[PDB]
PDB file of C-alpha atoms in Angstrom:
ATOM      1  CA  UNK F  11      -0.775  -1.983  -8.838  1.00 51.88           C
ATOM      2  CA  UNK F  12      -1.384   1.217  -6.953  1.00 49.11           C
ATOM      3  CA  UNK F  13       0.788   0.672  -4.634  1.00 51.88           C
ATOM      4  CA  UNK F  14       3.547  -1.190  -6.909  1.00 55.21           C
ATOM      5  CA  UNK F  15       3.539   2.321  -7.948  1.00 55.29           C
ATOM      6  CA  UNK F  16       4.355   3.889  -4.509  1.00 57.05           C
ATOM      7  CA  UNK F  17       6.771   1.330  -3.761  1.00 59.96           C
ATOM      8  CA  UNK F  18       8.384   2.274  -6.974  1.00 60.15           C
ATOM      9  CA  UNK F  19       8.464   6.130  -6.380  1.00 60.46           C
ATOM     10  CA  UNK F  20       9.970   6.017  -3.109  1.00 63.12           C
ATOM     11  CA  UNK F  21      12.666   3.756  -4.328  1.00 63.20           C
ATOM     12  CA  UNK F  22      13.277   6.210  -7.255  1.00 60.66           C
ATOM     13  CA  UNK F  23      13.145   9.350  -5.740  1.00 59.97           C
ATOM     14  CA  UNK F  24      14.121   7.597  -2.583  1.00 56.64           C
ATOM     15  CA  UNK F  25      17.512  10.085  -1.002  1.00 58.02           C
ATOM     16  CA  UNK F  26      19.796   9.982   1.702  1.00 55.30           C
ATOM     17  CA  UNK F  27      19.846  13.075   2.812  1.00 54.26           C
ATOM     18  CA  UNK F  28      22.251  14.831   4.836  1.00 58.19           C
ATOM     19  CA  UNK F  29      21.849  14.432   8.714  1.00 58.85           C
ATOM     20  CA  UNK F  30      23.314  17.857  10.558  1.00 58.55           C
ATOM     21  CA  UNK F  31      23.476  18.416  14.522  1.00 61.18           C
ATOM     22  CA  UNK F  32      22.831  21.396  15.374  1.00 60.47           C
ATOM     23  CA  UNK F  33      23.829  23.001  19.710  1.00 63.97           C
ATOM     24  CA  UNK F  34      21.563  26.078  20.749  1.00 62.07           C
ATOM     25  CA  UNK F  35      22.320  27.471  24.089  1.00 60.60           C
ATOM     26  CA  UNK F  36      18.975  29.984  25.407  1.00 58.49           C
ATOM     27  CA  UNK F  37      21.022  31.845  27.448  1.00 58.55           C
ATOM     28  CA  UNK F  38      23.519  33.003  24.409  1.00 58.64           C
ATOM     29  CA  UNK F  39      20.510  33.391  22.020  1.00 59.34           C
ATOM     30  CA  UNK F  40      18.443  35.016  24.195  1.00 56.49           C
ATOM     31  CA  UNK F  41      21.422  37.663  24.500  1.00 57.61           C
ATOM     32  CA  UNK F  42      22.196  37.965  20.959  1.00 56.02           C
ATOM     33  CA  UNK F  43      18.183  38.722  19.865  1.00 55.70           C
ATOM     34  CA  UNK F  44      17.969  40.690  17.046  1.00 55.63           C
ATOM     35  CA  UNK F  45      14.822  42.390  18.593  1.00 51.82           C
ATOM     36  CA  UNK F  46      14.688  41.431  22.454  1.00 51.96           C
ATOM     37  CA  UNK F  47      18.161  40.631  23.504  1.00 49.36           C
ATOM     38  CA  UNK F  48      18.982  39.944  26.775  1.00 52.64           C
ATOM     39  CA  UNK F  49      20.561  38.484  30.071  1.00 52.19           C
ATOM     40  CA  UNK F  50      18.090  35.048  30.035  1.00 50.97           C
ATOM     41  CA  UNK F  51      19.496  33.443  34.282  1.00 52.60           C
ATOM     42  CA  UNK F  52      19.412  37.276  35.202  1.00 54.41           C
ATOM     43  CA  UNK F  53      16.199  37.798  33.867  1.00 54.26           C
ATOM     44  CA  UNK F  54      15.376  33.690  35.200  1.00 54.26           C
ATOM     45  CA  UNK F  55      16.320  35.089  37.975  1.00 51.61           C
ATOM     46  CA  UNK F  56      14.372  38.431  38.653  1.00 48.04           C
ATOM     47  CA  UNK F  57      11.312  36.037  37.889  1.00 50.98           C
ATOM     48  CA  UNK F  58      11.960  33.544  40.521  1.00 51.45           C
ATOM     49  CA  UNK F  59      12.698  36.473  43.460  1.00 51.21           C
TER      50      UNK F  59
ATOM     51  CA  UNK D   1     -43.233 -40.800 -84.420  1.00 54.41           C
ATOM     52  CA  UNK D   2     -40.438 -37.886 -85.469  1.00 53.54           C
ATOM     53  CA  UNK D   3     -40.097 -37.438 -81.653  1.00 53.05           C
ATOM     54  CA  UNK D   4     -39.395 -40.901 -81.168  1.00 53.02           C
ATOM     55  CA  UNK D   5     -42.128 -41.922 -78.633  1.00 53.43           C
ATOM     56  CA  UNK D   6     -45.400 -43.919 -77.885  1.00 53.57           C
ATOM     57  CA  UNK D   7     -48.933 -43.293 -78.781  1.00 52.86           C
ATOM     58  CA  UNK D   8     -49.390 -41.054 -76.118  1.00 52.71           C
ATOM     59  CA  UNK D   9     -46.339 -39.472 -76.118  1.00 54.98           C
ATOM     60  CA  UNK D  10     -44.303 -42.137 -73.667  1.00 52.80           C
ATOM     61  CA  UNK D  11     -40.687 -41.511 -74.442  1.00 53.36           C
ATOM     62  CA  UNK D  12     -39.189 -44.703 -75.830  1.00 52.45           C
ATOM     63  CA  UNK D  13     -35.368 -44.075 -74.090  1.00 49.07           C
ATOM     64  CA  UNK D  14     -35.267 -43.422 -71.344  1.00 47.58           C
ATOM     65  CA  UNK D  15     -33.715 -40.829 -69.779  1.00 50.20           C
ATOM     66  CA  UNK D  16     -30.268 -40.338 -68.786  1.00 48.82           C
ATOM     67  CA  UNK D  17     -30.632 -39.647 -64.770  1.00 46.91           C
ATOM     68  CA  UNK D  18     -27.793 -37.113 -65.080  1.00 46.69           C
ATOM     69  CA  UNK D  19     -26.141 -38.416 -61.516  1.00 45.11           C
ATOM     70  CA  UNK D  20     -24.893 -34.636 -59.680  1.00 42.61           C
ATOM     71  CA  UNK D  21     -21.080 -33.691 -59.308  1.00 41.58           C
ATOM     72  CA  UNK D  22     -22.150 -33.410 -55.815  1.00 39.98           C
ATOM     73  CA  UNK D  23     -20.441 -31.191 -53.073  1.00 38.50           C
ATOM     74  CA  UNK D  24     -17.331 -31.423 -51.106  1.00 40.83           C
ATOM     75  CA  UNK D  25     -16.118 -30.778 -47.656  1.00 41.54           C
ATOM     76  CA  UNK D  26     -14.562 -27.571 -46.919  1.00 40.00           C
ATOM     77  CA  UNK D  27     -11.089 -27.341 -44.539  1.00 39.92           C
ATOM     78  CA  UNK D  28      -8.994 -24.292 -41.958  1.00 39.04           C
ATOM     79  CA  UNK D  29      -5.795 -24.412 -40.686  1.00 40.05           C
ATOM     80  CA  UNK D  30      -3.385 -22.830 -38.169  1.00 41.11           C
ATOM     81  CA  UNK D  31      -2.932 -18.450 -38.750  1.00 41.83           C
ATOM     82  CA  UNK D  32       0.811 -17.735 -36.814  1.00 39.19           C
ATOM     83  CA  UNK D  33       2.016 -14.067 -36.329  1.00 39.59           C
ATOM     84  CA  UNK D  34       5.571 -12.594 -34.759  1.00 40.17           C
ATOM     85  CA  UNK D  35       7.218  -9.503 -32.166  1.00 40.43           C
ATOM     86  CA  UNK D  36       9.845  -8.081 -30.515  1.00 41.06           C
ATOM     87  CA  UNK D  37      10.455  -7.354 -26.798  1.00 44.65           C
ATOM     88  CA  UNK D  38      10.348  -3.951 -25.778  1.00 43.59           C
ATOM     89  CA  UNK D  39      13.334  -1.084 -25.387  1.00 42.75           C
ATOM     90  CA  UNK D  40      15.130  -2.093 -21.545  1.00 38.19           C
ATOM     91  CA  UNK D  41      14.409   1.293 -19.765  1.00 40.11           C
ATOM     92  CA  UNK D  42      17.793   1.381 -17.965  1.00 40.70           C
ATOM     93  CA  UNK D  43      16.811   0.906 -14.277  1.00 38.36           C
ATOM     94  CA  UNK D  44      17.353   3.942 -11.835  1.00 39.01           C
ATOM     95  CA  UNK D  45      19.265   3.019  -9.103  1.00 37.85           C
ATOM     96  CA  UNK D  46      18.289   2.973  -5.532  1.00 34.29           C
ATOM     97  CA  UNK D  47      20.121   3.227  -2.542  1.00 34.17           C
ATOM     98  CA  UNK D  48      18.949  -0.085  -1.344  1.00 37.30           C
ATOM     99  CA  UNK D  49      20.883  -4.004  -1.060  1.00 33.06           C
TER     100      UNK D  49
END
């Protein structure tokens, strides 16, 4: 009975959620950061040096 | 002499047996009842097939 209740809740409150894909660039994100905005590849090359 | 008995009081006429009515049998029978159905709940349409 508990399993049937679980299945009933699942099949009633089931909702096909909207699927959204977002592309994020780390360089642009770090360059447009609100607090610490900096050049990602410049900092990477400096740290590698 | 008045009560029509013997010399020792024995009745001169034999008392009737007075056969009883005797008991009778008893009977029982079946009893039925009727009911209706429950209200049909509108099934929440899922997404499955």
